[PDB]
Design a protein around this ligand. Structure first.
Ligand SMILES: C[C@@H]1CCN(CCOc2ccc([C@@H]3c4ccc(O)cc4CC4(CC4)N3C(=O)c3ccccc3)cc2)C1
Ligand SMILES: C[C@@H]1CCN(CCOc2ccc([C@@H]3c4ccc(O)cc4CC4(CC4)N3C(=O)c3ccccc3)cc2)C1
Lengths: 227, 214
């Protein structure tokens, strides 16, 4: 029942803070820093999820399943957003800004590194606004695991698509409030959602890369933070 | 790119590839691998008729096909299997259900993902005009050159909106259904990645795709 501006305001206030890395740089300790960073970010990510409108209306089981499917996607689009204003670099933390040459120590790391840089350049070429970013991240949370889940499950898939419908209206309204014609509204909406296909592709490579090095957050852990 | 929305639909509808034709578990993957191998030629023939595709360089043409070939095979399978609930219609003489995929490690996980996609198509009542547009977007989005690809992608988006507006939908329903269609592409890319992993437990070579394009 939230208006478009009420949906934007709720998503902007639910935004998690930018976390930092340990202060006191070696390429040998890089992965320990990034693993520790992602671990701390996940706790704030679950707090943000529980404040995306309509997310806590679902059962905890489906809340867990949605985060199981989208947690790496959400970390990646967050990284890409933080790195948007720093070409050729990924801003994992304000005190942890890495270029492509430092991502060569691990085999297969640079392939995902270049993919993350390309998405960051894509966001840059579009002048993606923060209000559109929080909408795209909310879509990732609800859509990534809605096709891989009884009448209870049918009722909740219907609710997820209802919430996704409001986020779509919110994006359209944001593009209308900004002065875009109708053709530019539908075209930019399509442009944004098509990027989500590549973020999923990046997430699938990240998962594969992490398995070649306790990779996933467990069901009981995701449930413990959610509950 | 100068075509109208109605001319865009007609071009894609006539470019649709034909339905190819194809008992033990070991012979099952034999038939599936053989079927996909024969379908790739007709998929490339379909790609050449997607408006704006042949304006790309041959190098970029191949790269787009390398990137999208498994997604296009899957979304065409989901479209064929749409009115066969719980089953996957690989070929008219090759209709498989869930049980026939349990004998292979990691097959039922993907079989279920394809069936969930076909179930999503039924709930939305996807039309053939929308299907050929979703297939065209997969080809151009999966992989001067980037500017032209984005112009054709924006062209297919205009054609989709035109189809929904012609069907009497309000604008709210128009951009809602557009969003629902494009969010399925994320899951299709997911299935393609999971399918690639399962198949490697494959990829058409550059030279092979180039030969098929003349
Ligand atoms: C159960 C816990 C929860 C997951 N933990 C297990 C570790 O998973 C992780 C998850 C993420 C990252 C890291 C990281 C950190 C923060 C961020 O905002 C974003 C990212 C992004 C990224 C995946 C791309 N990453 C990379 O390093 C990396 C970048 C380029 C190419 C190769 C890799 C590290 C480890 C255990
Ligand atoms: C260069 C050549 C080009 C590809 N070749 C290498 C073989 O890759 C392939 C590609 C496709 C399939 C098959 C197939 C056939 C026709 C179709 O329309 C669709 C599909 C779909 C699919 C990938 C999902 N598949 C399945 O069986 C299968 C279904 C459920 C769960 C697990 C698997 C077989 C093998 C080499």
């Amino acid at each position: 029942s939230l208006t478009a501006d009420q949906m934007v305001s709720a998503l902007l206030d639910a935004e998690p803070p930018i976390l930092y890395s340990e202060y006191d740089f070696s390429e040998a300790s890089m992965m320990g820093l990034l693993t520790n960073l992602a671990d701390r970010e996940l706790v704030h990510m679950i707090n943000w999820a529980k404040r995306v409108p309509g997310f806590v209306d679902l059962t905890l089981h489906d809340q867990v399943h949605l985060l199981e499917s989208a947690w790496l996607e959400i970390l990646m689009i967050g990284l890409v957003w933080r790195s948007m204003e720093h070409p050729g670099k990924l801003l994992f933390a304000p005190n942890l800004l890495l270029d492509r040459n430092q991502g060569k120590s691990v085999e297969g790391m640079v392939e995902i590194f270049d993919m993350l840089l390309a998405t960051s350049s894509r966001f840059r070429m579009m002048n993606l606004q923060g209000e559109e970013f929080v909408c795209l991240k909310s879509i990732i949370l609800l859509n990534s695991g809605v096709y891989t889940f009884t009448l209870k499950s049918l009722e909740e898939k219907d609710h997820i698509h209802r919430v996704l419908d409001k986020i779509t209206d919110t994006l359209i309204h944001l593009m209308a409030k900004a002065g875009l014609t109708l053709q530019q509204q539908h075209q930019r909406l399509a442009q944004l959602l098509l990027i989500l296909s590549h973020i999923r592709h990046m997430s699938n490579k990240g998962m594969e890369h992490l398995y070649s090095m306790n990779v996933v957050p467990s069901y009981d852990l995701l449930l413990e933070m959610l509950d």
